[PDB]
Amino acid sequence: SGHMKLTLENFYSNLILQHEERETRQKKLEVAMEEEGLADEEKKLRRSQHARKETEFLRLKRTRL
Amino acid sequence: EATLGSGNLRQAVMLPEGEDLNEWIAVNTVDFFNQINMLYGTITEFCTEASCPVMSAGPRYEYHWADNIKKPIKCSAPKYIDYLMTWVQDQLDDETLFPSKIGVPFPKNFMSVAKTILKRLFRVYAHIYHQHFDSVMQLQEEAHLNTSFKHFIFFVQEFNLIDRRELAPLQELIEKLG
Ligand SMILES: [Zn+2]
């Protein structure tokens, strides 16, 4: 089946790229936080805020289906 | 054997930094459900009451359908899988198990629900590999199945979602991935 094949192929190509990107986003975040000179407690808060967005995204990603 | 790419699946299953474990398990589980019923969908013609009067995974394994203290039912592979996939889907649609509303928590027993779903999905792969790999090849979908399965196994290993014992029907295959 052609639908299955294309769909899986796309899924696996995306899966890897998204993973890589997500890692880079995390790093970039850490750098930005040093560059801005956020205090430790501030960094914690910032990480948490960003994490919330990502988990909300995951939910919707499932949910919208 | 063959896979769809040279991507690192071991890393891709890992919980991202700061991510919620329950949410991660939930999204990935929906994905595998979707994959497995697509994959099974492609060979459903070759999986009949005639070919598969029991839900087999080679000669050493015979699964019986159960959810309640209900007595497990011996049934054909097409039936077993029908029952299974309907049951899983129903869980996935249940707001109390898989909450949709933002901010709403997963239930107390969430891990248990996910594990139950995943160990059952595994049985579908096991049946396909043991009984319908000829059809898989014929359809040139070995790379697709193998990648899906590999992904699945890494995921369940990473989060301790299925016991070694439960994986036994495919132990050899799994080891090769090892
Ligand atoms: Zn069959």
Residue numbers in the entry:
A (entry chain C): 21 to 85
B (entry chain A): 33 to 99, 102 to 212
Publication passage describing the model:
The Hippo pathway is vital for organ growth control and tissue homeostasis, and its dysregulation has been linked to various human cancers.
To delineate the interaction of MOB1 with NDR2 on the atomic level, we determined the crystal structure of the MOB1/NDR2 complex at 2.1 Å using purified MOB1 (residues 33–216) and the NTR of NDR2 (residues 25–88). The central intermolecular interactions between MOB1 and NDR2 are hydrogen bonds and van der Waals interactions, with the two antiparallel α-helices of NDR2 representing two interaction interfaces. In the α2 helix Arg42, Leu78, Arg79, and Arg82 of NDR2 interact with Glu51, Glu55, Trp56, Val59, Phe132, Pro133, Lys135, and Val138 of MOB1. MOB1(Q67A) and MOB1(H185A) mutants did not interact with NDR2, illustrating that the observed MOB1/NDR2 interaction is specific. Most significantly, we discovered that His646 of LATS1 bonds with Asp63 of MOB1 supported by a cluster of surrounding residues involving Phe642, Met643, Gln645, Val647, and Val65019, while Phe31 of NDR2 does not interact with Asp63 of MOB1. Consequently, our structural comparison suggests that Asp63 of MOB1 specifically bonds with LATS kinases through His646, which is conserved in human LATS1/2 and fly Wts, but replaced by a bulky Phe/Tyr residue in human NDR1/2 and fly Trc. MOB1/NDR2 complex formation is dramatically increased by prior MST1/2 phosphorylation of MOB1, while the MOB1/LATS1 interaction appears to be fully dependent on MST1/2 phosphorylation of MOB1.
